[PDB]
Design a protein around this nucleic acid. Structure first.
Lengths: 141, 148, 38
RNA sequence: AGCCAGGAUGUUGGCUUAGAAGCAGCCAUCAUUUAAAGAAAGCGUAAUAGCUCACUGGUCGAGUCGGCCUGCGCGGAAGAU
């Protein structure tokens, strides 16, 4: 990629591409088609998984017919479904209560290595530590 | 800019490259972006790993500060921006060709390939440094020139 | 006009100028800011 | 100082709310790519959006900034034969 036009990243539903309240028309209305988002998005989404937030950016200029593109999951929410307590803090960040695993935080970042500058695979992990310690999440490391 | 014990580090590394370097080109990143340097990063990774370093230094006392020792022609490659692509163990193997290709993708510019000082010339995109190891193109005609 | 005994810059855009021997606050961004000594 | 650029990721931080996406509030005020980019200073919105600003990179090529002491001046300063 060398040039981007615009993007509205929102956490939308992999199971079925048709939410009324969450986004509905707000997903794309400025040249975007809500009819092209249930005929192609679910085309590639049966090939990995459905159910969790899958952000999507849409390529609409003025020709009415875009080229949907994928995205990658969030890393701060990766410690909610894969690490421990979902929320992360529970209380205001004054007292450390959270925790993480030691074998994890190494493979749970290799999935999202397609958006990490740190060349080395482990230099990608070192960044996770900051992500994982957002509130001070104390690894029994 | 801390005082002087910081910039001199830049001059040290740059002089180490220019003197202990090889054939290299320029890359004029007037409006550098994320992905242009990322492709340059992969390209440098191909050359034996990380020695095709490319830092954003067009600055006289910073990049032009190592010219006097080696590459004593960088005053004219001292202007608005020259992200000199200094080399290291090896040769020209594909540095110029790869630049010549990646700049022609509209990647920002290379100031019309201002060029480094391997030769006694200034700007000449050459393709005469791709092949430096091949020793098998000479064993292709041995089993077809015996019968006749 | 804020025509005030005390006048001052309010924001970054506010400029102090004297013209005809009088202080004025003149603001590029905010018509409100634009003042006067009296 | 202006003049060209950027002003980015987790993120829209979470609630309580009606909605809250920097900007209603309360509160944490952290971390990342690092040239740098405030969980945000203004504007802006239905709320996003959007627009700036902060800091930082480019041109340019001498000075430049705000405190102290004191001299002299300005305003504050409107009455009736």
């Amino acid at each position: 990629a060398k040039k981007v036009q615009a993007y509205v990243k929102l956490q939308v539903a992999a199971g079925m591409a048709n939410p009324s309240p969450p986004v509905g028309p707000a997903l794309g209305q400025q040249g975007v088609n809500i009819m092209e988002f249930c005929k192609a998005f679910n085309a590639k989404t049966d090939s990995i998984e459905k159910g969790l937030p899958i952000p999507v950016v849409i390529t609409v200029y003025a020709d009415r017919s875009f080229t949907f593109v994928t995205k990658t999951p969030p890393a701060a929410v990766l410690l909610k479904k894969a690490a421990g307590i979902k929320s992360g803090s529970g209380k205001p960040n004054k007292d450390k209560v959270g925790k993480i695993s030691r074998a994890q935080l190494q493979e749970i970042a290799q999935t999202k290595a397609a958006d990490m500058t740190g060349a080395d695979i482990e230099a990608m992990t070192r960044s996770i530590e900051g992500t994982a310690r957002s509130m001070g999440l104390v690894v029994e490391d | 800019m801390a005082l002087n014990l910081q910039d001199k580090q830049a001059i040290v590394a740059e002089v180490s490259e220019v003197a202990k370097g090889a054939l290299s080109a320029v890359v004029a990143d007037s409006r550098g972006v994320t992905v242009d340097k990322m492709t340059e990063l992969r390209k440098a990774g191909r050359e034996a790993g990380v020695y095709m370093r490319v830092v954003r230094n067009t600055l006289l006392r910073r990049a032009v500060e190592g010219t006097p020792f080696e590459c004593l022609k960088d005053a004219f490659v001292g202007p608005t921006l020259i992200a000199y692509s200094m080399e290291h163990p090896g040769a020209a193997a594909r540095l110029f060709k790869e630049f010549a290709k990646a700049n022609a993708k509209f990647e920002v510019k290379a100031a019309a390939f201002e060029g480094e000082l391997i030769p006694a010339s200034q700007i000449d995109r050459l393709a005469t440094l791709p092949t430096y190891e091949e020793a098998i193109a000479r064993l292709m005609a041995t089993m077809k020139e015996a019968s006749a | 006009m804020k025509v005030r005994a005390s006048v001052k810059k309010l924001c970054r855009n506010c400029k102090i100028v004297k013209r005809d021997g009088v202080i004025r606050v003149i603001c590029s961004a905010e018509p409100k800011h634009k003042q006067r000594q009296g």
